[PDB]
Amino acid sequence: PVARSWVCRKTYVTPRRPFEKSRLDQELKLIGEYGLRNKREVWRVKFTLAKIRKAARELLTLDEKDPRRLFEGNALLRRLVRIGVLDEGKMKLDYILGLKIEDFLERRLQTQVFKLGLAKSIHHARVLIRQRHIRVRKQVVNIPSFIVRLDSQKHIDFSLRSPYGGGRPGRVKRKNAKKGQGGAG
Amino acid sequence: SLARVGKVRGQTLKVAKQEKKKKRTGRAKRRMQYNRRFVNVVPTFGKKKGPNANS
Amino acid sequence: GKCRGLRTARKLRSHRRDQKWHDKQYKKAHLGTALKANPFGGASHAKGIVLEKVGVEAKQPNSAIRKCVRVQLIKNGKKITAFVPNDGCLNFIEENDEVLVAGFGRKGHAVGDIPGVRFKVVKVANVSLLALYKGKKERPR
Amino acid sequence: TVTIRTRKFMTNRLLQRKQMVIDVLHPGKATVPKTEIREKLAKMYKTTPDVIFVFGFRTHFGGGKTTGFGMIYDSLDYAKKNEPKHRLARHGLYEKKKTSRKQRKERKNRMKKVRGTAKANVGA
RNA sequence: CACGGGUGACGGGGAAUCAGGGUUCGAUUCCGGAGAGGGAGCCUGAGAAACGGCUACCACAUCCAAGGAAGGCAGCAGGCGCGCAAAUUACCCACUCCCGACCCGGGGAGGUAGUGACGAAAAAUAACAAUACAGGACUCUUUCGAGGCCCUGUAAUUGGAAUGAGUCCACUUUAAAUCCUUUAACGAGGAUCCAUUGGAGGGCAAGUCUGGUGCCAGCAGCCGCGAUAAUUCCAGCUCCAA
């Protein structure tokens, strides 16, 4: 008997048919549009979409003016508003089912950096996330799976310790300066 | 019988591996894959040939 | 169902309990005769000793001389025709060598062109036949 | 530019101490040492740094925030009354034993065998 | 459906698959039952038919000066055998508790380190710009060609900019260490600091490309390929799945 959790959950579910041409076409279009790393990066968002739509179907099967239905519906709509996929005027549990994988992928921090335009490309934005040049509310975000909130969307800028912002320059600039001073004398 | 084991592997000519520029991997591999699938080609009439289709 | 009474639950349960045995998979799962007759004993892999190498003539239209190995197990001593999968990999197996033997996937059935042979060879003296075919490792001499 | 804030402040008279959670903001430098933490808490609380024991630093990701726990005693006698000997030895006013536990178990089981006054002759 | 027998049956809370129904596993960290190789018997003690308690038999087994004495790792590590199958003869009572005459001592319970691709989560192996080019929403021209207000990709053609795997002051972490994060100074253009595992007739995505073999060797979970022009073998290139 040791003191630990043993609680884990698979965030992705593989599809039933492995080699559907239309499914591979859709996933290839999704990655080529939104700059993703593999197919598991699509499948985990598809399974969170499966969770949200299955919860929405379970709430729509319930009767109107039910306390559990209203509580879970208002909680799920509050979660969708605070992650910023659903609009503030569309906060109704019947409009959750008309929501899509592209609208879930538009709120990725890679896509948020690409839409705010401080980067050049989507994969170049992922390069900036890897190389740790940006911060979100004085917190460096190294992992591009950060769900950007609607309140924290405007707080995305370059980080403090950053050669692209107000910091010391990097290895290539220091090597060029050292080579220039060695060539000068 | 049992005396002809490895006949074709013994009698074929070994061809060395040709040197090649190393492949980009991961997100860059899938980006290059999308770029050679969609944005380079145009929709033409008839049946579209495969990637490995040669004449 | 056939009888549709209100209190025929024990009749339906006893009838289905008697008629589950007529299924092949239920009988193979719940009688110990097939589990005793299985040389693996409900296992996936088994080590054994090579005693001879047999050239087996193939079946119907597709004809060949397949290279099987008579393997005597350790835990039971039973003899198995095991199949050497890849090309030229019979010469890597000599007499009196401990080899690893597994199934083929059809769950105890001869597959394709090879009659009466259910099992195959995976590893040969802690060196895999895949590595011996690829040339990655070397047989210890 | 190193800034120390104190949250969750509590006055434990039954422990004869003050306690707080220390948040250290250091923009663009490394982790400050416990000596500088004790000096800055001393010049903040206007007390002697001998009764200020700070432990358990955790640095957040990014490098601009660390969080630890601290307590401030009233006297060194009260600190030695209720303060662990290992954290006293972290600062150096106490020295623990140097006999290792396997040799102590071996010496104890050897003294268990021999019966009488001669256990002092058995041990070392 | 008693009685009798078998179970690769400890039971349950639970786990997987799942429309609804069900099916399979549960020895396993939580509770209850049984026990220290197999039975049996007892002192102590409130509580034991106790085995890091004894007493007799069966099996195993230690030292002996040959008279005797002594044992129970289905505890912690570790060794042999059995195996398809499973880790160190490490550190500590500091975190959680327990015991005692008890604020102090002890605890292979427990915690922390080493092996570890059972498994679960996150996620490196690049990007930008310039030149040659191949094209898309417009003006003109029947086409040929021109312009870029808007573009997208390719190329051992070139260029800096940035960072991490690793080495490594120091700080922190900790009972003392270790790992994470921070921070000096190092450290990438075939960024050699090089990513593999299977397949390419159908199911099920992907060459009737090249050389050799010629019902041989071999491929293939199923149908089926291979008798000198193999889209299925063996190799080179390319592509597909992760």
Side-chain angles (χ1 to χ4, degrees), chain A residues 150-172:
Chain A
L150 186 63
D151 186 74
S152 179
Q153 185 178 2
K154 67 181 181 180
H155 295 89
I156 296 169
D157 55 354
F158 292 100
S159 67
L160 295 175
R161 180 63 64 85
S162 66
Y164 290 160
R168 294 179 66 250
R171 195 269 306 275
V172 174

PDB file of all heavy atoms in Angstrom, chain A residues 150-172:
ATOM      1  N   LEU A 150     -10.854  33.898 -23.471  1.00  0.00           N
ATOM      2  CA  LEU A 150     -11.287  35.137 -24.112  1.00  0.00           C
ATOM      3  C   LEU A 150     -10.831  36.360 -23.327  1.00  0.00           C
ATOM      4  O   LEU A 150     -10.527  37.401 -23.921  1.00  0.00           O
ATOM      5  CB  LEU A 150     -12.808  35.136 -24.275  1.00  0.00           C
ATOM      6  CG  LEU A 150     -13.441  36.296 -25.047  1.00  0.00           C
ATOM      7  CD1 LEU A 150     -12.956  36.305 -26.489  1.00  0.00           C
ATOM      8  CD2 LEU A 150     -14.960  36.224 -24.986  1.00  0.00           C
ATOM      9  N   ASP A 151     -10.757  36.251 -21.999  1.00  0.00           N
ATOM     10  CA  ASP A 151     -10.232  37.344 -21.192  1.00  0.00           C
ATOM     11  C   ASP A 151      -8.717  37.453 -21.302  1.00  0.00           C
ATOM     12  O   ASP A 151      -8.171  38.559 -21.218  1.00  0.00           O
ATOM     13  CB  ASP A 151     -10.641  37.159 -19.729  1.00  0.00           C
ATOM     14  CG  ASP A 151     -10.253  38.339 -18.860  1.00  0.00           C
ATOM     15  OD1 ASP A 151     -10.910  39.396 -18.962  1.00  0.00           O
ATOM     16  OD2 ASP A 151      -9.290  38.210 -18.075  1.00  0.00           O
ATOM     17  N   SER A 152      -8.027  36.331 -21.502  1.00  0.00           N
ATOM     18  CA  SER A 152      -6.575  36.310 -21.602  1.00  0.00           C
ATOM     19  C   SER A 152      -6.083  36.318 -23.044  1.00  0.00           C
ATOM     20  O   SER A 152      -4.897  36.069 -23.283  1.00  0.00           O
ATOM     21  CB  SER A 152      -6.018  35.091 -20.866  1.00  0.00           C
ATOM     22  OG  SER A 152      -4.609  35.036 -20.973  1.00  0.00           O
ATOM     23  N   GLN A 153      -6.967  36.584 -24.008  1.00  0.00           N
ATOM     24  CA  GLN A 153      -6.553  36.629 -25.407  1.00  0.00           C
ATOM     25  C   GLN A 153      -5.701  37.859 -25.701  1.00  0.00           C
ATOM     26  O   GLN A 153      -4.715  37.774 -26.442  1.00  0.00           O
ATOM     27  CB  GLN A 153      -7.783  36.600 -26.315  1.00  0.00           C
ATOM     28  CG  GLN A 153      -7.462  36.534 -27.800  1.00  0.00           C
ATOM     29  CD  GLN A 153      -8.704  36.446 -28.663  1.00  0.00           C
ATOM     30  OE1 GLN A 153      -9.827  36.475 -28.159  1.00  0.00           O
ATOM     31  NE2 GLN A 153      -8.510  36.335 -29.972  1.00  0.00           N
ATOM     32  N   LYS A 154      -6.053  39.005 -25.119  1.00  0.00           N
ATOM     33  CA  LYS A 154      -5.330  40.242 -25.389  1.00  0.00           C
ATOM     34  C   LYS A 154      -4.019  40.352 -24.621  1.00  0.00           C
ATOM     35  O   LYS A 154      -3.246  41.279 -24.884  1.00  0.00           O
ATOM     36  CB  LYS A 154      -6.211  41.451 -25.063  1.00  0.00           C
ATOM     37  CG  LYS A 154      -6.530  41.607 -23.588  1.00  0.00           C
ATOM     38  CD  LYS A 154      -7.423  42.811 -23.343  1.00  0.00           C
ATOM     39  CE  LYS A 154      -7.714  42.990 -21.863  1.00  0.00           C
ATOM     40  NZ  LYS A 154      -8.588  44.167 -21.605  1.00  0.00           N
ATOM     41  N   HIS A 155      -3.750  39.441 -23.689  1.00  0.00           N
ATOM     42  CA  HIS A 155      -2.535  39.480 -22.887  1.00  0.00           C
ATOM     43  C   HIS A 155      -1.406  38.639 -23.473  1.00  0.00           C
ATOM     44  O   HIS A 155      -0.500  38.243 -22.733  1.00  0.00           O
ATOM     45  CB  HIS A 155      -2.834  39.019 -21.460  1.00  0.00           C
ATOM     46  CG  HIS A 155      -3.756  39.931 -20.711  1.00  0.00           C
ATOM     47  ND1 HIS A 155      -5.127  39.790 -20.741  1.00  0.00           N
ATOM     48  CD2 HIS A 155      -3.504  40.994 -19.912  1.00  0.00           C
ATOM     49  CE1 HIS A 155      -5.679  40.728 -19.991  1.00  0.00           C
ATOM     50  NE2 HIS A 155      -4.716  41.472 -19.478  1.00  0.00           N
ATOM     51  N   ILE A 156      -1.441  38.355 -24.771  1.00  0.00           N
ATOM     52  CA  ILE A 156      -0.398  37.573 -25.425  1.00  0.00           C
ATOM     53  C   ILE A 156       0.590  38.526 -26.084  1.00  0.00           C
ATOM     54  O   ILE A 156       0.228  39.281 -26.993  1.00  0.00           O
ATOM     55  CB  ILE A 156      -0.993  36.597 -26.451  1.00  0.00           C
ATOM     56  CG1 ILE A 156      -1.885  35.569 -25.751  1.00  0.00           C
ATOM     57  CG2 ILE A 156       0.113  35.907 -27.234  1.00  0.00           C
ATOM     58  CD1 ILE A 156      -2.712  34.729 -26.698  1.00  0.00           C
ATOM     59  N   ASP A 157       1.839  38.492 -25.626  1.00  0.00           N
ATOM     60  CA  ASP A 157       2.898  39.324 -26.177  1.00  0.00           C
ATOM     61  C   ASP A 157       4.226  38.596 -26.011  1.00  0.00           C
ATOM     62  O   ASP A 157       4.278  37.469 -25.510  1.00  0.00           O
ATOM     63  CB  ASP A 157       2.906  40.713 -25.523  1.00  0.00           C
ATOM     64  CG  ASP A 157       3.000  40.659 -24.000  1.00  0.00           C
ATOM     65  OD1 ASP A 157       2.951  39.557 -23.411  1.00  0.00           O
ATOM     66  OD2 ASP A 157       3.116  41.740 -23.384  1.00  0.00           O
ATOM     67  N   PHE A 158       5.304  39.249 -26.436  1.00  0.00           N
ATOM     68  CA  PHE A 158       6.633  38.672 -26.289  1.00  0.00           C
ATOM     69  C   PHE A 158       7.059  38.676 -24.825  1.00  0.00           C
ATOM     70  O   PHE A 158       6.674  39.551 -24.046  1.00  0.00           O
ATOM     71  CB  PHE A 158       7.647  39.442 -27.134  1.00  0.00           C
ATOM     72  CG  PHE A 158       7.439  39.293 -28.613  1.00  0.00           C
ATOM     73  CD1 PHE A 158       6.793  40.283 -29.341  1.00  0.00           C
ATOM     74  CD2 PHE A 158       7.892  38.164 -29.279  1.00  0.00           C
ATOM     75  CE1 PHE A 158       6.601  40.149 -30.706  1.00  0.00           C
ATOM     76  CE2 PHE A 158       7.702  38.022 -30.644  1.00  0.00           C
ATOM     77  CZ  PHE A 158       7.057  39.017 -31.357  1.00  0.00           C
ATOM     78  N   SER A 159       7.860  37.681 -24.453  1.00  0.00           N
ATOM     79  CA  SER A 159       8.249  37.507 -23.063  1.00  0.00           C
ATOM     80  C   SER A 159       9.342  38.499 -22.672  1.00  0.00           C
ATOM     81  O   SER A 159       9.898  39.219 -23.506  1.00  0.00           O
ATOM     82  CB  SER A 159       8.726  36.075 -22.809  1.00  0.00           C
ATOM     83  OG  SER A 159       9.931  35.804 -23.500  1.00  0.00           O
ATOM     84  N   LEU A 160       9.641  38.531 -21.372  1.00  0.00           N
ATOM     85  CA  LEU A 160      10.637  39.468 -20.858  1.00  0.00           C
ATOM     86  C   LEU A 160      12.048  39.014 -21.213  1.00  0.00           C
ATOM     87  O   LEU A 160      12.788  39.725 -21.903  1.00  0.00           O
ATOM     88  CB  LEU A 160      10.473  39.625 -19.346  1.00  0.00           C
ATOM     89  CG  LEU A 160       9.154  40.266 -18.906  1.00  0.00           C
ATOM     90  CD1 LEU A 160       9.029  40.276 -17.390  1.00  0.00           C
ATOM     91  CD2 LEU A 160       9.019  41.672 -19.475  1.00  0.00           C
ATOM     92  N   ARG A 161      12.439  37.828 -20.753  1.00  0.00           N
ATOM     93  CA  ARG A 161      13.706  37.230 -21.172  1.00  0.00           C
ATOM     94  C   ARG A 161      13.510  36.710 -22.591  1.00  0.00           C
ATOM     95  O   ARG A 161      13.101  35.568 -22.817  1.00  0.00           O
ATOM     96  CB  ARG A 161      14.144  36.131 -20.210  1.00  0.00           C
ATOM     97  CG  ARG A 161      15.466  35.473 -20.586  1.00  0.00           C
ATOM     98  CD  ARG A 161      16.617  36.466 -20.559  1.00  0.00           C
ATOM     99  NE  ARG A 161      16.867  36.998 -19.224  1.00  0.00           N
ATOM    100  CZ  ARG A 161      17.626  36.395 -18.314  1.00  0.00           C
ATOM    101  NH1 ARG A 161      18.209  35.238 -18.596  1.00  0.00           N
ATOM    102  NH2 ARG A 161      17.805  36.950 -17.124  1.00  0.00           N
ATOM    103  N   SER A 162      13.785  37.577 -23.560  1.00  0.00           N
ATOM    104  CA  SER A 162      13.606  37.245 -24.965  1.00  0.00           C
ATOM    105  C   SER A 162      14.510  38.116 -25.824  1.00  0.00           C
ATOM    106  O   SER A 162      14.499  39.347 -25.693  1.00  0.00           O
ATOM    107  CB  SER A 162      12.146  37.424 -25.383  1.00  0.00           C
ATOM    108  OG  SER A 162      11.759  38.784 -25.312  1.00  0.00           O
ATOM    109  N   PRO A 163      15.309  37.515 -26.710  1.00  0.00           N
ATOM    110  CA  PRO A 163      16.100  38.321 -27.653  1.00  0.00           C
ATOM    111  C   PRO A 163      15.260  39.030 -28.700  1.00  0.00           C
ATOM    112  O   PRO A 163      15.735  40.008 -29.291  1.00  0.00           O
ATOM    113  CB  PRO A 163      17.038  37.290 -28.293  1.00  0.00           C
ATOM    114  CG  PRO A 163      16.332  35.994 -28.124  1.00  0.00           C
ATOM    115  CD  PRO A 163      15.581  36.075 -26.839  1.00  0.00           C
ATOM    116  N   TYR A 164      14.034  38.572 -28.946  1.00  0.00           N
ATOM    117  CA  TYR A 164      13.123  39.259 -29.850  1.00  0.00           C
ATOM    118  C   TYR A 164      12.394  40.413 -29.177  1.00  0.00           C
ATOM    119  O   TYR A 164      11.763  41.217 -29.872  1.00  0.00           O
ATOM    120  CB  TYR A 164      12.110  38.265 -30.425  1.00  0.00           C
ATOM    121  CG  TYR A 164      12.706  37.264 -31.393  1.00  0.00           C
ATOM    122  CD1 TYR A 164      12.053  36.071 -31.676  1.00  0.00           C
ATOM    123  CD2 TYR A 164      13.930  37.506 -32.013  1.00  0.00           C
ATOM    124  CE1 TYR A 164      12.596  35.150 -32.555  1.00  0.00           C
ATOM    125  CE2 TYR A 164      14.478  36.591 -32.892  1.00  0.00           C
ATOM    126  CZ  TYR A 164      13.807  35.416 -33.158  1.00  0.00           C
ATOM    127  OH  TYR A 164      14.348  34.501 -34.032  1.00  0.00           O
ATOM    128  N   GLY A 165      12.461  40.509 -27.851  1.00  0.00           N
ATOM    129  CA  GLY A 165      11.887  41.627 -27.130  1.00  0.00           C
ATOM    130  C   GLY A 165      12.933  42.416 -26.369  1.00  0.00           C
ATOM    131  O   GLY A 165      13.987  42.751 -26.919  1.00  0.00           O
ATOM    132  N   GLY A 166      12.655  42.720 -25.104  1.00  0.00           N
ATOM    133  CA  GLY A 166      13.596  43.452 -24.280  1.00  0.00           C
ATOM    134  C   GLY A 166      14.529  42.566 -23.480  1.00  0.00           C
ATOM    135  O   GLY A 166      14.432  42.507 -22.250  1.00  0.00           O
ATOM    136  N   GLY A 167      15.441  41.875 -24.161  1.00  0.00           N
ATOM    137  CA  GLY A 167      16.373  40.996 -23.480  1.00  0.00           C
ATOM    138  C   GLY A 167      17.725  40.891 -24.155  1.00  0.00           C
ATOM    139  O   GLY A 167      18.022  41.635 -25.094  1.00  0.00           O
ATOM    140  N   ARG A 168      18.553  39.967 -23.676  1.00  0.00           N
ATOM    141  CA  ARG A 168      19.873  39.771 -24.255  1.00  0.00           C
ATOM    142  C   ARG A 168      19.761  39.026 -25.584  1.00  0.00           C
ATOM    143  O   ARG A 168      18.897  38.159 -25.734  1.00  0.00           O
ATOM    144  CB  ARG A 168      20.764  38.985 -23.294  1.00  0.00           C
ATOM    145  CG  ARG A 168      21.098  39.710 -22.002  1.00  0.00           C
ATOM    146  CD  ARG A 168      21.971  38.846 -21.100  1.00  0.00           C
ATOM    147  NE  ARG A 168      23.295  38.615 -21.671  1.00  0.00           N
ATOM    148  CZ  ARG A 168      23.713  37.444 -22.143  1.00  0.00           C
ATOM    149  NH1 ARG A 168      22.907  36.392 -22.117  1.00  0.00           N
ATOM    150  NH2 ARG A 168      24.935  37.327 -22.644  1.00  0.00           N
ATOM    151  N   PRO A 169      20.614  39.336 -26.561  1.00  0.00           N
ATOM    152  CA  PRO A 169      20.570  38.614 -27.836  1.00  0.00           C
ATOM    153  C   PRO A 169      21.088  37.189 -27.700  1.00  0.00           C
ATOM    154  O   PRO A 169      21.742  36.819 -26.723  1.00  0.00           O
ATOM    155  CB  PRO A 169      21.475  39.448 -28.749  1.00  0.00           C
ATOM    156  CG  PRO A 169      22.413  40.128 -27.819  1.00  0.00           C
ATOM    157  CD  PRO A 169      21.622  40.413 -26.572  1.00  0.00           C
ATOM    158  N   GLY A 170      20.784  36.384 -28.714  1.00  0.00           N
ATOM    159  CA  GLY A 170      21.007  34.956 -28.656  1.00  0.00           C
ATOM    160  C   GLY A 170      22.390  34.528 -29.112  1.00  0.00           C
ATOM    161  O   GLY A 170      23.323  35.324 -29.248  1.00  0.00           O
ATOM    162  N   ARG A 171      22.499  33.219 -29.376  1.00  0.00           N
ATOM    163  CA  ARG A 171      23.795  32.582 -29.595  1.00  0.00           C
ATOM    164  C   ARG A 171      24.414  33.020 -30.917  1.00  0.00           C
ATOM    165  O   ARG A 171      25.625  33.249 -30.988  1.00  0.00           O
ATOM    166  CB  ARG A 171      23.633  31.057 -29.547  1.00  0.00           C
ATOM    167  CG  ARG A 171      24.926  30.228 -29.403  1.00  0.00           C
ATOM    168  CD  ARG A 171      25.567  29.808 -30.733  1.00  0.00           C
ATOM    169  NE  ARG A 171      24.644  29.100 -31.615  1.00  0.00           N
ATOM    170  CZ  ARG A 171      24.396  27.796 -31.551  1.00  0.00           C
ATOM    171  NH1 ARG A 171      25.006  27.043 -30.646  1.00  0.00           N
ATOM    172  NH2 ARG A 171      23.541  27.243 -32.400  1.00  0.00           N
ATOM    173  N   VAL A 172      23.599  33.146 -31.968  1.00  0.00           N
ATOM    174  CA  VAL A 172      24.124  33.513 -33.281  1.00  0.00           C
ATOM    175  C   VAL A 172      24.590  34.965 -33.286  1.00  0.00           C
ATOM    176  O   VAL A 172      25.644  35.290 -33.846  1.00  0.00           O
ATOM    177  CB  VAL A 172      23.063  33.231 -34.363  1.00  0.00           C
ATOM    178  CG1 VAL A 172      23.515  33.723 -35.732  1.00  0.00           C
ATOM    179  CG2 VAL A 172      22.775  31.743 -34.420  1.00  0.00           C
TER     180      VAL A 172
END
